[PDB]
Amino acid sequence: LVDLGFSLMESYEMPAQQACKLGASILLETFKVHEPIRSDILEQVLNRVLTKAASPVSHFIDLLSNIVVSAPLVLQNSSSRVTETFDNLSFLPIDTVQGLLRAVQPLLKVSMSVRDSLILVLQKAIFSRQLDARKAAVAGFLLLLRNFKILGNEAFCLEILGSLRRCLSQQADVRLMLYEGFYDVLRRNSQLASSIMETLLSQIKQYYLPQQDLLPPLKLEGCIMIFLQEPLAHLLCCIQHCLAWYKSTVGFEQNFEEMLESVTRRMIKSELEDFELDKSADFSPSSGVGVKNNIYAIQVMGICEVLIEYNFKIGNFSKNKFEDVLGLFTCYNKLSEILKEKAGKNKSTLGNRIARSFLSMGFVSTLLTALFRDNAQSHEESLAVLRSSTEFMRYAVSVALQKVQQLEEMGQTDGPDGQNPEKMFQNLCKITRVLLWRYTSISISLLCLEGLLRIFNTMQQLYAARIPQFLQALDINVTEKAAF
């Protein structure tokens, strides 16, 4: 049986996918019920995953996770032969390392030796100046922080704080994923969260330019080494999301809110006259200055989008903040609709829509549910003037189309709660109705309908086991509801 499975994974590389499924099934069954050979099975699967990256090899990690969640003691019975696997930081650590650490999480926690090996291997990996090695290091950091839980050994907590702070000085590409992954570990700490906010605040002071509502605080000149050094938009998005988490959880926090508020009040007062990119054609592809304008142009778009989330969330049916949102998108559209996609890149017809957005699936769900299918006395007549901005309407849904497309092509999305399948499932369960309500209220409806096509496509292709609740959530036999 075990030889047949080994050569099954060998012969894989859709009938090939079915062969993978059969091999995983037989290997799991022969591992679960056969005691003295389970160590041999673990050795075989450990020897088979290595030197295998050209073919889709996600099967190795997934069946390994299944067999270790069924029986975690096998690795210790095998004297923890996973230490040698730490060299995989150079072959293909784009997703394999993340899944492998996910699988081995309980055995790293229970076993101190493997934890020590992991921390030392990642410590020597982080300061390797290779892009791939640094990507592997930051990927491992994204998991090790949440490997240990204290939210509900303090030296272990405080010692890990400075590693990512030191790694922050590296390139923008490796500065990227930490902004996204900070929230996941911030959902798992109380005072480590305070230290993380302080570090992020010190980071954002680098480009704040505290000047009290004057010429715009654009220190993008530092992110030029034609090249880019820090993704300001991702940092701002992480700042907003972590601030929201801290506010919901319960000195600098009051300063943190006011400087964020000051920035919002500064963007509304800093238009495309104080900006350096006031020319309609300063952009030039394959030029040393044009691409510098292009990266400045794309970066500020993410800057505007983040504060749209802030003002909408920090204000609660308060007309003063709603007009701020209007001004932010006014700056956004005035600089995104034209200049870019006129001189930036529109020579080929844009198949996609408004550029990669840095919003929250939770936020866009709240926005659409509050915008459409919501009419109460708590509404302060702000949506009435907000509804006049039909350009904001098109963007308000096109971002959602971008997010679920990420769930279409890939298995995840951006923003908080991008990896908890039930979480977007509830989000998808909620946004679909108002998406349908907007279509049935009576282009703009063309956008929401296109989304529904991609919810149903994603529902069947990804959440196949979760179809009955989604079908019933539109208000058990699926056909009667489907026929409806």
Partner: protein, 168 residues
């Protein structure tokens, strides 16, 4: 001796030799104690200057350098940003010995101005034996964190062009 007294009130003990570091195993209280000591007694150019003189007098001993085997506590203040650099320079002509500071600078990127420090490290590399030069050449990626890629690539290509025997 001013730095020695500051260590006495908050820091290591006055012991020059080959023993262990007399520092508390923590970085939230002992480090804060050292910071408050360095921010309470030194508050003027003269007192910080005499503190720097005392630090130079104390750490100059090779016994203290062997005791070092951390230095991140010193780097927590901006006034020691070039002090650690010049102490590294003083510790580098000790071999095969600079291996300690080579490994100590690993997992450490506190620096004053990396752009000039790179030029200075090849300047001292022009007068170094072969093995230490090999280790330092390996250590050019160590001192950087991928923020000076163009110039460092240019200079390493120059080193490759000049040195063929030491290409490895």
């Amino acid at each position: 001796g001013v730095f020695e007294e500051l260590l006495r009130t908050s820091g290591i003990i006055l012991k020059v030799g080959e023993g262990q570091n007399e520092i508390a195993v923590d970085q939230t209280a002992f480090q804060k104690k050292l910071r408050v000591a360095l921010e309470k007694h030194p508050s003027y150019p003269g007192v910080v200057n005499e503190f720097i003189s005392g630090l130079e007098s104390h750490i100059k001993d090779r016994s203290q350098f062997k005791n070092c085997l951390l230095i991140k506590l010193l780097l927590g203040i901006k006034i020691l940003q070039p002090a650690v650099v010049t102490l590294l320079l003083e510790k580098i002509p000790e071999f095969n010995f600079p291996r300690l500071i080579v490994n100590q600078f690993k997992w450490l990127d506190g620096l004053l101005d990396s752009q000039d420090l790179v030029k200075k490290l090849m300047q001292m590399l022009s007068v170094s034996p072969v093995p230490i030069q090999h280790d330092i050449i390996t250590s050019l990626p160590e001192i950087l964190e991928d923020s000076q890629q163009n110039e460092v690539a240019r200079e390493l290509s120059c080193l490759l062009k000049q040195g063929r025997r030491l290409t490895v």
